[PDB]
Every structure is written in C-alpha cells, then in structure tokens.
Design a protein around this ligand. Structure first.
Ligand SMILES: CC(C)(COP(=O)(O)OP(=O)(O)OC[C@H]1O[C@@H](n2cnc3c(N)ncnc32)[C@H](O)[C@@H]1OP(=O)(O)O)[C@@H](O)C(=O)NCCC(=O)NCCS
Ligand SMILES: CC(=O)NCCc1ccccc1
Length: 210
C-alpha cells in the first residue's frame, strides 16, 4: 500500500537519496555512461521542485518508493535567446546527456505542435524503486499530475523518454509519440555517442492532451 503526495522542497534530500539509489544507476543513459557521482544531476533534479507539481509515491513506512519530477514549461518569448543546457555543465558524462537533450530541442519544439498553448507540463525525472515496479506506480504518479493540470488549465503533458522501454509505459498511460531519434542516428560530431542495448532504440518524446 502506498500514497501519492506533493513533493516539498524540504523533501529534497530524501528525493536525491532515492534517485541516487535507482535512477542515477538504472536510467538507460545513466547506466550506459556509468554516471557515478553527479552533483549536476542532483541540481537538475531539485530544480523543478518549487514549481509545486512534482509527486512522490510513499510506502506504509513513509519511505519514498517513486517520484515523478515535473516542471512548467513556457512557450519561448518571441525574442527568446535559446541556451544550450550543456554549456553550464562541468560533469563530462552528464554533459553528454544534456547535449543530447539540447540536440532534441534543436530538432523538435513541443510548442510547434501546440501553437495555442502557453504553458505545458514537462515530466523531467521518473523513477520507481525496483521492488515496487510493475505495480502501476508510474501510472498513479502520472495521474496525479492530471489533477494539477486540471486545476491550472494546462492541457499538454510532455515527457522525454530515454528508451523505448519507458516510452511504452507512457503509451500504456495514454501518451503518444511526438518525436523520436534513434541512438544509432545521433551523431553530433560525426560519430555515435550512445550505444545501449538494441531494444532501447533511442529517445521518444511523448505527449498527452488531458
Ligand atoms: C520506467 C519506470 C518508472 C516504470 O515504473 P513502474 O511503476 O514499474 O511502471 P509499470 O507498473 O507500469 O510497469 C511497467 C512495465 O514494467 C514491466 N514490469 C513488470 N514487472 C516488473 C518488475 N518487477 N520490474 C521491472 N519491470 C517490470 C512490465 O512490462 C510493465 O508493464 P505492464 O505492467 O503494463 O505489463 C521504472 O521501470 C523505472 O524506474 N525505470 C528506470 C528509470 C527510467 O528509465 N525512468 C524513465 C526515464 S524516461
Ligand atoms: C521522464 C524521465 O525520467 N526522463 C529522463 C531523462 C534523463 C534525465 C537525466 C539523466 C538521464 C535521463
């Protein structure tokens, strides 16, 4: 038995402890790179918390067994200066992940898909404790975000998935692909950067209109 609760920034340490145990070690990109200690990813993960739309799954003992960290994304201003997230990163392995993210954003803008939308919910970090996987926790974390969206007049939930495996979970939850890129085709400087196992395939950006 578990609950789904809003994460407070004072939960930051417990969220990071959980992510270090699971996500830092078992997201397909993190594990491919053997990420290790990564304070930049800790910083990245804590950033969306004050947006007040991130959720934790908590077991009967009060331990965090899952999180979905979300941030609000606003349509770029007409005079927007696009910045590469990778430019502010010192960690070489995480920089590769940020560079991949920058590349996706250079190729695909979710706001082009939804010209009328000013604000979109962005699902940034999804992680469930191994012993609690396959129980629908990812779905219940996601569903709680629908409540936030309803309350705040947000229509679109956008989630960049790091593998076809997790994209399939989002499909089950009613999301559909809006962009994809195979790892085999991601060659920023002429050569492949990510070579995880074949079934991962590549990134898929998933979206749902609620
Ligand atoms: C992706 C992830 C959050 C899914 O969470 P979840 O709460 O287990 O989600 P679900 O319960 O819907 O299970 C998803 C699928 O995992 C598989 N599964 C079943 N039992 C499982 C288990 N004990 N362990 C792992 N996977 C299992 C099933 O294929 C299941 O689909 P199905 O129940 O519809 O048949 C989780 O696997 C995870 O933390 N992965 C590592 C980090 C990651 O990749 N995050 C997403 C980045 S986009
Ligand atoms: C929804 C979700 O969890 N996307 C993960 C992207 C990602 C971010 C940082 C490191 C590795 C991978």
């Amino acid at each position: 038995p578990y609950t789904i609760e809003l994460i407070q920034p004072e939960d930051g340490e417990a969220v990071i402890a959980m992510l270090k145990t699971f996500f830092f070690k078992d997201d397909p990109l993190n594990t491919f790179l053997d990420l290790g200690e990564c304070k930049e990813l800790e910083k990245y993960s804590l950033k969306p918390l004050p947006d007040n739309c991130s959720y934790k799954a908590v077991n009967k003992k009060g331990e965090i067994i899952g999180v979905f960290l979300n941030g609000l994304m606003r349509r770029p201003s007409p005079d927007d200066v696009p910045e590469k997230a990778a430019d502010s990163c010192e960690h070489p392995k995480f920089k590769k992940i940020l560079s991949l993210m920058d590349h996706v954003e250079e190729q695909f803008n979710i706001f082009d898909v939804y010209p009328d939308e000013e604000l979109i919910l962005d699902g940034k970090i999804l992680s469930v404790d191994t012993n609690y996987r396959g129980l629908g926790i990812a779905g219940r974390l996601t569903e709680r975000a629908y409540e936030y969206m309803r309350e705040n007049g947000i229509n679109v939930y956008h989630v960049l998935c790091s593998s076809h495996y997790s994209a399939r979970v989002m499909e089950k939850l009613g999301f559909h692909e809006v962009f994809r890129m195979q790892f085999a085709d991601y060659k920023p400087q002429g050569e492949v950067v990510f070579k995880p196992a074949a079934p991962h395939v590549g990134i898929q950006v998933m979206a749902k209109e609620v």
